[PDB]
Symmetry: D2
Subunit: 115 residues, 4 copies
């Protein structure tokens, strides 16, 4: 897995489960085309997004339906979703782990790039 | 000021100065109409982006151009930028303060919303 | 004000009001001498804890009593409190702004430090 | 493992490796006695701190030498260390995962409580 996403709930201190998300690549005319989607498991993680063969260097956009997570939980969020936008490098270490910590009015996002 | 943004540098423990930002609105056709743009000051803050009259009900997006900030200081950051999307003013006028904290491989963001 | 603290609620998207804090200093014998205490205001901010003259070189600790904040709102938080330790003024007088962001199971903290 | 700690570097986007830390229990006269210590591995994680038999309900304090991490890296930190203080519950779910995200002038800490 070259690209993995882990989401967390800062309110209950548990993984954020059944969080829908959609990944995107910036096309040459700078529009976002679907690339991958899925929902976080019971560990709040989602793997097998892509393959290193399909995962070529470029601008990518992960989009987390954070609003729908809180909605279903009966809580009023601030954000419509959370978007993570980065360039996938090749020369550089190429195992991306993206983590999002979620609260109603706040979220944080970090990238762990390893070999 | 019904909408303000504040940025800090987590690496230097200081306001993030000269940070460029673009604000967008979601048109009836679901595209991002331009709404306002600016640069944080010496205090890392951006004010007077809009007005009570112009800042109506809608879904807005603030895009903080963090990459270009990090480059100037010799750093290759992870994120192209930081994006903030939210519905505003759907139950009357509110005031929105957006805070962004920036690290090369991480950023956080928070909303203070006040009934004026 | 050479030292200030600001607290926000990440759950309500608002300043964290009536939050009690205790500031300590590290004595020559390595114990925590009391230094100052207070409660955040309506704006979630605490000012005038000390002074330039009284705020000398040292290792200080700010302890933010977050548990008692969450209880009052019906929540059982994870952390007993939030602690901030740092050396201050070891290369001349500085001004310190401490920011705390609070969730029931998470908190962040940031320092802005300015040469006056 | 009832008690695990994962630390991350927000500057380089890698796990924080070889981070020393010390855990503590609040004694009846409210002093902190050593309970456990160790250093984070190459995954920036540290496990096998205690056992669920030794891990009785009480006030605990994890102490992360964040200053020494940055020091060795040639970077000037703000904090002397990072302290996480919580009550270990029994009735409640009892697998604690503590995560600390580290920058020179800032850090965040979150708890994931699971079964």
């Amino acid at each position: 897995c070259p690209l993995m996403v882990k989401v967390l709930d800062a309110v209950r201190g548990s993984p954020a489960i059944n969080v829908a998300m959609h990944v995107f690549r910036k096309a040459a005319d700078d529009t976002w085309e679907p690339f991958a989607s899925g929902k976080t498991s019971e560990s709040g993680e989602l793997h097998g997004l892509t393959t290193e063969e399909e995962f070529v260097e470029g601008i990518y956009k992960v989009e987390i339906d954070t609003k729908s997570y809180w909605k279903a939980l009966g809580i009023s969020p601030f954000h419509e979703h959370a978007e993570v936008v980065f360039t996938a490098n090749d020369s550089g270490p190429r195992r991306y782990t993206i983590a999002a910590l979620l609260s109603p009015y706040s979220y944080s996002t970090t990238a762990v790039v390893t070999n």
